[PDB]
Design a protein around this ligand. Structure first.
Ligand SMILES: *S(=O)(=O)c1ccc(Br)c(-c2nnc(-c3cc(Cl)c(O)c(Cl)c3)o2)c1
Ligand SMILES: *S(=O)(=O)c1ccc(Br)c(-c2nnc(-c3cc(Cl)c(O)c(Cl)c3)o2)c1
Lengths: 116, 116, 115, 115
């Protein structure tokens, strides 16, 4: 439960289902290492990406594959993806929810950070 | 469960707790009649505003008392409130989630509409 | 011009053109009195709503007719309109830009208040 | 000018001034090559990044240094930066404005693409 991604569709007023999500972690050599990936469910949510053991301090990138999502609805969108880059767990473990609200030429993203 | 309001704080990265919410319904004489009210919980959510029986077709206004919320954090915000005005249930009963993401000089709002 | 309204379309990536905008001022009896109105230009902007003399401190509402905008594009929208309610304050900066970014089931709004 | 970046501050209701912005172009080997950079002006805008000749079709990334912006205001932010990745397309309108509205734990971004 340390990392959860929630994606909403501003055109339809619905969860954004079947959205691919790739998570990377910056390595010591400054490259982005693949960390976890998955797809949003029918609720627009992606659970089970990581564990509290594996989710150590670091800089993480959550790539939400918005272009692929829109094309499949018949919309040719602006962005390639929405990327969310953040330092995690640097004051000890936290739980992160990364949310995104998608439109064809815009998105909004926020984080809800809680201390267990 | 027909109407739920969720409020998030973009400054803190947290639910917006203890936010007053007033719901009105437009009457036949074109006035706004008080319909329901409540406060967001520690999760940022307000449940139990209405019932499927009472929540008939109509034009509804959800007033989120953002100014009061910000002042209590020591911030003098721009808006008096965030108002969300919509026609509900005009193709039969639906479930509505009204979400708002608040900043001192801005907000975003969306709806998730589902058919039970 | 102390008040300008800017409206953007998040579906097409464009200004929102020919959107009706109505401004109201709260009266002493708590009713909303018509104050100014117009339609957004080809740039998505509505200028010339008021003057410095007329735009006194008080509570104002800007109503943006989003439903009609979407209907004309053939897209079913959620909201009847977008509403922005705020207090004008003499102690703050003097020019108010109310911006709105529209989608069918969501909108975002901000204020840019400058000198 | 085919590309402009505009940055707004949702906490203060103002342009976001002196924000570093870096633009990259995706190379054939999938690396990001520096393309242009600058700092936002007192209006929150960054003009003059590129020319029509240089801004050929391809994938571009605009990185906005939000963390430094918030740190200078004393506010602890969530993101390292805001990122906007898009394809430039000759068949669409010719002028791209990338706008971002910043909060400490959230941002919104849009594109206004016009002729
Ligand atoms: S809650 O259960 O966590 C919950 C319930 C419903 C919703 Br719709 C949400 C939620 N999470 N994020 C957002 C959101 C993100 C952005 Cl970027 C935005 O602009 C808006 Cl208006 C909402 O809603 C949470
Ligand atoms: S116009 O000259 O282009 C113009 C004038 C004033 C403003 Br404030 C803007 C503008 N550009 N983008 C935005 C904006 C972006 C987002 Cl992501 C957002 O959520 C909102 Cl509410 C506004 O405003 C353009």
């Amino acid at each position: 439960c340390p990392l959860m991604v929630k994606v909403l569709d501003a055109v339809r007023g619905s969860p954004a289902i079947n959205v691919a999500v790739h998570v990377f972690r910056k390595a010591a050599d400054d490259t982005w290492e693949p960390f976890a990936s998955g797809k949003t469910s029918e609720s627009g949510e992606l659970h089970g990406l990581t564990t509290e053991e594996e989710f150590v301090e670091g800089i993480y990138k959550v790539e939400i594959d918005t272009k692929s999502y829109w094309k499949a609805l018949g919309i040719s969108p602006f962005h390639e993806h929405a990327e969310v880059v953040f330092t995690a767990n640097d004051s000890g473990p936290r739980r992160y929810t990364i949310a995104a609200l998608l439109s064809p030429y815009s998105y909004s993203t926020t984080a809800v950070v809680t201390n267990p």
